[PDB]
Design a protein around this ligand. Structure first.
Ligand SMILES: [Mg+2]
Ligand SMILES: [Mg+2]
Ligand SMILES: [Mg+2]
Ligand SMILES: [Mg+2]
Lengths: 146, 145
């Protein structure tokens, strides 16, 4: 398996990255991954109504809800190419090239994934729901001293 | 009773997984569609859901078949089994204790966010022992009587 290697599109990635990550921090925030995935060219682009597509790529995240270009890359190319046991070669390969060929040792300590962050967000709401309920039950308690 | 602008979102999730375009998702996806939507579905809850809508063994859930399902989940008030799981998601080390700091973090930054002053009262209540470390199972039992 060897799919559309649109190889002036791997480049089109970088331009649009630079639009979002000017300092070349290697990181963009979550609250922007939608806009980013969109404003690319048509193969790698993930058009709007975008959110749930993102959480499903299982993108790792690091402190401060940042995400790394090299995770975003493979994630987005995995989409345009189709999943396969042969991709597992692709990942560990596109990252060994990137690593030897990079003098920038950077902070890479992954916290969540875009998946967890979703289950995390609703579990918060469960706890947030019960405690708003309880708070009120409590306020009516205090109301009814008798 | 009725759902909301979250129909916008259920549509999004459903639409993504329907690669064919027949407006019906293959039932083994159902479990995947929902994990992508934030919910926790057991292979049991799946089965009961699956054969309580698809009683005709076709493997079909069209979008109405689906929107009514969620309407039945949202509908109910969360359990205590569920407030338990939800807390356990945030006790990453796995010891039954969560810090009044990590709590306050999660609580003030995820979901229907709690204001600084609500969380204050949450901690006053959950941390009886002043050590800023709360046994959440102990806290569940506090908001259940
Ligand atoms: Mg279909
Ligand atoms: Mg059906
Ligand atoms: Mg703990
Ligand atoms: Mg304590």
């Amino acid at each position: 398996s060897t799919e559309p290697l649109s190889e002036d599109d791997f480049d089109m990635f970088y331009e649009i990255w630079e639009k979002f990550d000017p300092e070349a921090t290697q990181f963009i925030e979550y609250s922007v991954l939608s806009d980013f995935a969109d404003a690319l060219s048509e193969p790698l682009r993930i058009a709007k109504p975008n959110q749930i597509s993102l959480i499903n790529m299982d993108l790792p995240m690091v402190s401060g809800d940042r995400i790394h270009c090299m995770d975003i890359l493979f994630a987005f190319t995995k989409r345009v190419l189709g999943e396969s046991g042969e991709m597992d070669a692709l990942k560990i390969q596109m990252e060994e090239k990137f690593m030897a060929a990079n003098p920038s040792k950077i902070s890479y300590e992954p916290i969540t994934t875009t998946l967890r962050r979703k289950h995390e967000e609703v579990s918060a709401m469960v706890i947030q729901r019960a405690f708003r309920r309880h708070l009120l039950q409590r306020s009516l308690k205090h109301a009814s001293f008798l | 009773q009725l759902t909301e602008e979250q129909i916008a979102e259920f549509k999004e999730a459903f639409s993504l997984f329907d690669k064919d375009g027949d407006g019906t998702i293959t039932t083994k996806e159902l479990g995947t569609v929902m994990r992508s939507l934030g919910q926790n579905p057991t292979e049991a809850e799946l089965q009961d859901m699956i054969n309580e809508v698809d009683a005709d063994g076709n493997g079909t859930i069209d979008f109405p078949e689906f929107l009514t399902m969620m309407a039945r989940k949202m509908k109910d008030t969360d359990s205590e089994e569920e407030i338990r799981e939800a807390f356990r998601v945030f006790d990453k080390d796995g010891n039954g204790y969560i810090s009044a700091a990590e709590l306050r973090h999660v609580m003030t930054n995820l979901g229907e966010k709690l204001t600084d002053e609500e969380v204050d009262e949450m901690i006053r209540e959950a941390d009886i022992d002043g050590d800023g470390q709360v046994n959440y199972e102990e806290f569940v039992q506090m908001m259940t009587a």
